[model samples]
Target: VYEKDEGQKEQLERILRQSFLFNSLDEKDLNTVILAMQEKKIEASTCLIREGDDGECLYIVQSGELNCSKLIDGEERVVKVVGPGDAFGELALLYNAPRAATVTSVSACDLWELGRDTFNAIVKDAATKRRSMYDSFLKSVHILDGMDAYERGKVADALRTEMFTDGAYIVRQGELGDVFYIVEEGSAVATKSFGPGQPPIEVKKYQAGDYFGELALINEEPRAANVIAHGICKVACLERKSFKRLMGSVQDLLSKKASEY
Candidate 1:
């Protein structure tokens, strides 16, 4: 038994808000989860999870710490120390698989647990929708041409969604590029200085199925143009690492297309 005070709730809210599994949720959606989580307590030296166990809930530490060990080559190797606000058990629920590690409470501790049913209906469903949406959209991306369903789905999973209001800068000219953005909804305007001492002028318009910021990433330099949201817009972003891994075969096509900008 432990405290479930407002202080703890506020702290848990912040922790889960930033946590990977919950980061995509809007404020109202996040509130549902904060209210839905169940509080659990464990005594010191209690085993909480074991490798290969069919785990059905996601767990987050409320207080104290836990040790996570993975079995490697017949040896249980302690791989991590999970302190307050740390989370685990997501891999099992997300992948529909068994636990990947074993965990034991190092001290008497409290945890916030969200059951598989709630997680599946809430987070998993939303993620699946976005993935399917992006998967279909990725098929239309010219740079991703020739990518099959399985390979395109891999890129879909790597995408993170971004929303913008009118006149917001999606990409600033001269910023070091580490991201590639594709317009998924609405549109954006690209502006650039055409000559020395000249004011920035609108050079291009981006609609759904269009992309930007990849030229700089491909050339290994700062973004060459400033992109501003034309209206309320939804964009999908892929990190440089993911793009590099997935775009290897299409390198020449991308470089050739970069000639205009």
Candidate 2:
């Protein structure tokens, strides 16, 4: 059975405060989530989640390090490192699909675990708040501002969050755009290549509430510039397929506008 003492609660709260997944939650919601977690101690080299395993829960790292890896073109590659106050296995809680990647402990770790059922119980209201945030963000974008509640909800449902480290390229120039992005946290710089062996010229800067990549996706053209993470950045993305299907009319309009220019 899960047990919590006053000391444990305080410690857990402190850790949760640092987590991106829990930082936005109010005290009541945060307390509910904290209570649902079960503490776990994992040793180095232990596999936390294996690729293709059934996903049922997510873990919040209290201390130590974890390696996140994935198989790409039949080869395993390290994708990210999870550290204190970070979370992994969150995709499992969102959808009961097979794990997309494998996560292993890099060193002894302290973690807090919450099963899908428990997570859903505490996050249901938070989901509403999240959707509201998405909606507000949409309203700020001229192309998306015209959407009604139903349309905004459709976009919200398609939105997925992604994180990138400093200097990571979110989109590269001359590449086919497959996603549209909205900055949720941190910053990024949009730059255009001068030519081979030359430095890229910085054209614009983006921060929270800023969005990009729409010109390429809507026009079905290569990306005009490269967007690189300026720091630890987080963004909400909507895939091309979802955007085309859900916003067909808007896509046509944007495409038409692009052709006119």
Candidate 3:
């Protein structure tokens, strides 16, 4: 059974098992993740989450119940009620989306909160595909020069992998951006989006060996043009969040960065 009070000896193991996010974790990893996650509480009738709120943490309900409601078309509707072992607010952390519903405590509740650091380190970084994709990305990005294999592996733990279908827009021009993309498979095209009914100009074609979006990484400005997948493609990406961390830890690469391999 689940235990309460954030007691490590008593509840840590149970919390690790209760979280679906930790399903793939081995005992040691489970203990590590549980150590990063913190137990919290909500009193009866309290608002656990509000619709439209941007959540910084994912919450897992360990005990008690939560009533979920949503504002659909300006009218409030009951979505569902979550009980023990249930979770909510995941999309907010992964996709930067607003909370889809309001979560109100039906009774005194015990909850576990995984902040962004814990979520990325414990869940996202643990995926093999994500790790491989990141390793490939770091190798391709010459700007990250001077990094050894061990350093690359450390950087790998921060990258995220995503896929795009043929002709899909990977990145758009004139939008605030903070991420860079590296093509892991297939090809893509960089194009300038014209006015309605006007044809887009193909600025460049990128294959599996190439990557785009470096302009955003260097200047922290909007993209110069839209990048669309020429075919079904897989990519590994690094964002400002990782950049900030890297700047602090790997200051040696700040000057005279590498241009190409």
Query: TM per model?
Result: 0.74, 0.52, 0.47
* Residue lDDT tens for model 3, 135-168: 7767876645667877777767655556899989
Candidate 2 per-residue lDDT, tens place, 1-261, comes to 478899888988987755545555778888988888899999999988999898888998888999999989988799999898778898766666789899999999999998888777787457557767877777776666667879877887667677889999999998989998989889999998777777789988998877788888766799988999997788988888888888857776666666532
Looking at model 2, report the run of 10 residues with the lowest lDDT sum.
252-261
**Which stretches of candidate 3 lie above 4 Å from their native place?**
1-133, 140-145, 193-199, 247-261
Ranking by lDDT: 1, 2, 3
Which structure is stronger by lDDT: 1 or 2? 1
Score each candidate by Cα lDDT: 0.85, 0.82, 0.71
Model 2 / residue 188 / CA error / Å = 26
- Specify the poorest-scoring 10-residue window by lDDT in model 1: 1-10
Name the candidate that leads on lDDT: 1
lDDT of 1 by residue, 172-255 (tens): 887988998999899999999776688899999999988888887789998888999997779888889888987666667778
What TM-score does candidate 3 reach? 0.47
Count of backbone clashes, every candidate in sequence: 0, 0, 0
